[PDB]
Design a protein around this ligand. Structure first.
Ligand SMILES: OC[C@H]1O[C@H](O[C@H]2[C@H](O)[C@@H](O)[C@@H](O[C@H]3[C@H](O)[C@@H](O)[C@@H](O[C@H]4[C@H](O)[C@@H](O)[C@@H](O[C@H]5[C@H](O)[C@@H](O)[C@@H](O)O[C@@H]5CO)O[C@@H]4CO)O[C@@H]3CO)O[C@@H]2CO)[C@H](O)[C@@H](O)[C@@H]1O
Ligand SMILES: OC[C@H]1O[C@H](O[C@H]2[C@H](O)[C@@H](O)[C@@H](O[C@H]3[C@H](O)[C@@H](O)[C@@H](O[C@H]4[C@H](O)[C@@H](O)[C@@H](O)O[C@@H]4CO)O[C@@H]3CO)O[C@@H]2CO)[C@H](O)[C@@H](O)[C@@H]1O
Ligand SMILES: OC[C@H]1O[C@H](O[C@H]2[C@H](O)[C@@H](O)[C@@H](O[C@H]3[C@H](O)[C@@H](O)[C@@H](O[C@H]4[C@H](O)[C@@H](O)[C@@H](O)O[C@@H]4CO)O[C@@H]3CO)O[C@@H]2CO)[C@H](O)[C@@H](O)[C@@H]1O
Ligand SMILES: [Ca+2]
Ligand SMILES: [Ca+2]
Ligand SMILES: [Ca+2]
Length: 637
């Protein structure tokens, strides 16, 4: 490069990784020093332009040359944004004579952008254990029956007239005629999870467990809560939970663990005593009497038959949050004995909440995604963080969750359907998570990923729940057509991307399954051993991620987007490690020349592909590696 009236986009780079930001999660008194990379001698001047919410205006900070990288290929320019309590958004203006370029969250641009700027949210912190961990999601009744003395037998009880149906471990999910799918039980329980912690924390290596609803409810999924204060009998009792939590936090059975519970706070089940639609309690529920002490916990359009609910499901009456200080806000999160605080405080001390149907929470029966909804989650964060600043808050949302994350006053992260699950599905399987024809090329995949990461503050990005499948979508293995290699590729990307790798139980060995409830099959324990190819890769990958902090909190830079050979390469790097991930999304092998010079990997140095164990030497800024079809290489140094 040189001073030739031309800014070379390929040499430019910035993100909030260690090499470019000295304060990614600053307090009110900490200044933020940013570094912008360019090819050596490529420009004449650069400036940081930031919008300050404190005065609703732009501010200008000219940058100064700082240093060259070890390879002498790049320049690092720097500038500092002053410390203050206000949220700020920044972008860079880059000039080389008569040539000007702009750069922000969405990368380089010839014209000045007005969106996707980088974020500076003083005092906003997401749990670092979440940024650095690996999560394992378990649907209780389908993981492992550790105690058969609490199994829901056929005809054990009825819900809305229908009797429960038990099935042999491994048998089909769908309920035989005469029963309901929501009332099928296999026997999975807490005791089982406790007994299988070794498989979770050692065989695989995950250190975070996220469980679907475990509180008293008639169904098998239990999103229709009957009693938030009690573990459902089919899963055990509250003592069983305390023991499970102890064994999860214990370091005697593997690395320290964390437990995230599913918080179903937008609605209760219609069988909850506050509502009591079928009169299962001597008390008078809202549905039973307009004089009920909990009558105003719900919203009736036509008492008692027509009321606000989750997506029209009468079995899920919607909770009325009213105004600040309401009784409902109290039992959910404000009260010391609320659902949220009870489990976060001893003797439970869980580590987080996954917020079910979070966008809908509101007052008076409204549908959320409004001012009131956001005020509620703001108060929710204060309540939760007040009890435990290191308790995670992850909201369920299918699209861009920027509205509940980008102001640092609500959630720490969200279910990453739009930024991970969907794009990964369409690129690798040619299907969307619903299993409908939907394919994207490598260049599109990469663009999609950048655009979605840009929707969030960096600490939020690193905390996103990135799963291949989950209880509401079709199994990746099914969308893949039963092809294990596609799962191999998905796992490699998952374990080396930005955000919390989240493994939906069974996905580690390639468990198949269609749409609800076929996506909740029982777990096959004979297939959960390193003797399984996917399981073995999962354990190896988790070990790899755990070894390199760069994979969890390092920078992310695109290296290759080849639509011809279907090759995708990107680097993850920090002050210590430089890793070039090379993914082959084609059905045939390809020899790729990886431009590791972009990550500043010194010529003559070596890199090890941790997937195959093979070693390579960097020559002329390149690493030549032959990657099998639907496989990948993790070249690290
Ligand atoms: O005259 C009969 C009756 O018919 C109609 O009701 C039927 C529904 O239209 C039909 O869809 C079906 O409902 C099923 C549903 O299809 C099935 O998927 C299941 O849904 C559960 C989930 O399994 C459960 O996980 C939970 O969902 C969570 C979700 O997982 C979570 O991530 C987040 O999204 O929040 C959700 C809610 O907390 O709950 C849902 C709903 O319970 O089970 C459903 C059955 O309850 O079958 C219905 C009955 O046949 C009409 O609508 C009705 O008016 C008629 O009376
Ligand atoms: O201040 C007025 C000056 O304006 C003009 O200077 C320009 C240069 O032409 C640009 O190239 C640039 O200079 C940068 C340079 O691009 C950058 O690499 C870095 O240079 C380092 C170098 O990397 C390092 O290896 C070692 O050699 O030290 C160098 C100097 O620190 O930093 C330079 C900035 O100091 O921008 C300047 C300013 O716009 C003009 O050519 C000058 O005659 C004039 O004085
Ligand atoms: O919440 C949903 C929305 O989420 C996303 O919006 C983000 C932007 O992507 C971020 O860049 C930022 O926006 C800042 C902006 O960076 C800042 O400059 C200022 O906006 C200026 C604007 O630059 C200027 O051209 C002119 O229009 O004045 C504006 C001031 O009003 O302030 C913005 C914040 O208000 O944060 C938002 C919100 O997190 C997504 O891009 C949106 O599509 C989505 O609706
Ligand atoms: Ca130039
Ligand atoms: Ca059991
Ligand atoms: Ca009653």
């Amino acid at each position: 490069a040189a001073n030739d009236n031309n800014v070379e986009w390929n040499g430019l780079f910035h993100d909030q990784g260690p090499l470019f930001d000295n304060a990614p999660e600053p307090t009110s008194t900490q200044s933020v020093t940013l570094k912008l990379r360019t090819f050596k001698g490529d420009i004449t001047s650069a400036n940081i332009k930031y919008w300050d919410t404190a005065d609703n205006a732009f501010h200008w900070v000219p940058m100064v040359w700082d240093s060259n990288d070890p390879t002498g290929t790049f320049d690092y320019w720097k500038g500092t944004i002053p410390a203050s309590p206000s949220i700020k958004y920044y972008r860079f203006q880059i000039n080389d004579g008569t040539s000007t370029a702009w750069y922000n969250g969405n990368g380089p641009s010839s014209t000045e952008p007005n969106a996707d700027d980088f974020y500076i949210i003083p005092n906003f912190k997401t749990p670092d254990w979440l940024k650095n961990g690996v999560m394992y999601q378990i649907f209780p009744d389908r993981f492992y029956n550790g105690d058969s003395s609490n199994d829901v037998q056929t005809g054990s009880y009825t819900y809305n007239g229908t009797p429960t149906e038990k099935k042999a471990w491994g048998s089909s999910v769908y309920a035989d005629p005469g029963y309901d799918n929501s009332l099928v039980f296999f026997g999975g329980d807490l005791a089982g999870i406790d007994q299988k912690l070794g498989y979770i924390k050692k065989t695989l290596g995950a250190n975070i467990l996220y469980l679907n609803p475990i509180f008293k409810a008639p169904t098998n999924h239990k999103y229709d809560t009957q009693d938030y204060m009690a573990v459902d009998p089919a899963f055990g009792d509250n003592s069983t939970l305390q023991t499970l939590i102890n064994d999860i936090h214990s370091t005697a059975n593997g690395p320290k663990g964390y437990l995230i519970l599913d918080g179903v706070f937008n609605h209760t089940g219609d069988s909850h005593p506050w509502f009591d639609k079928y009169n299962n309690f001597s008390s008078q529920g809202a549905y039973e009497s307009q004089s009920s002490p909990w009558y105003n916990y719900y919203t009736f359009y036509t008492w008692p038959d027509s009321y606000a609910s989750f997506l029209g499901f009468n079995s899920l009456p919607k909770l009325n949050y009213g105004n600040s200080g309401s009784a409902v806000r109290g039992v959910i999160y404000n009260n010391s004995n609320s659902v949220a605080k009870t489990y976060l405080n001893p003797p439970y001390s869980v580590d987080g909440w996954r917020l079910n149907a979070a966008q809908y929470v509101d007052a008076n029966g409204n549908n959320g995604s409004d001012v009131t909804n956001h005020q509620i989650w703001s108060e929710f964060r204060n309540a939760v963080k007040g009890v435990n600043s290191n308790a995670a808050i992850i909201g369920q949302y299918w699209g861009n969750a920027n509205p509940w994350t980008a102001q640092g006053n609500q959630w720490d992260a969200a279910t990453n359907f739009d930024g991970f699950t969907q794009p990964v599905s369409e690129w690798i399987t040619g299907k969307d998570y619903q299993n409908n024809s939907a394919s994207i090329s490598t260049t599109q995949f990469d663009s999609w990923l950048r655009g979605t990461r840009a929707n969030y503050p960096t600490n939020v990005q690193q905390s996103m729940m990135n799963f291949l499948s989950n209880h509401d979508i079709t199994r990746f293995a099914t969308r893949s057509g039963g092809d294990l290699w596609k799962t191999y590729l998905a796992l490699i990307f998952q374990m080396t991307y930005v955000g919390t790798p989240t493994i939906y139980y069974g996905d580690e060995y390639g468990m198949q399954g269609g749409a609800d409830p076929d996506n909740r099959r029982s777990f096959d324990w004979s297939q959960a051993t390193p003797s399984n190819s996917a399981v073995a890769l999962t354990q190896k990958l988790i070990t790899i991620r755990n070894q390199y902090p760069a994979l969890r909190t390092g920078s992310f830079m695109t290296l290759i987007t080849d639509d011809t050979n279907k090759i995708y390469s990107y680097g993850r790097f920090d002050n210590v490690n430089r890793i070039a991930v090379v993914l082959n999304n084609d059905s045939v092998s390809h020899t790729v020349n990886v431009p590791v010079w972009q990550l500043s990997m010194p010529n003559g140095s070596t890199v090890t592909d941790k997937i195959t164990g093979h070693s390579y030497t960097v020559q002329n800024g390149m690493v030549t590696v032959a990657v099998d079809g639907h496989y990948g290489a993790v070249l690290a140094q």
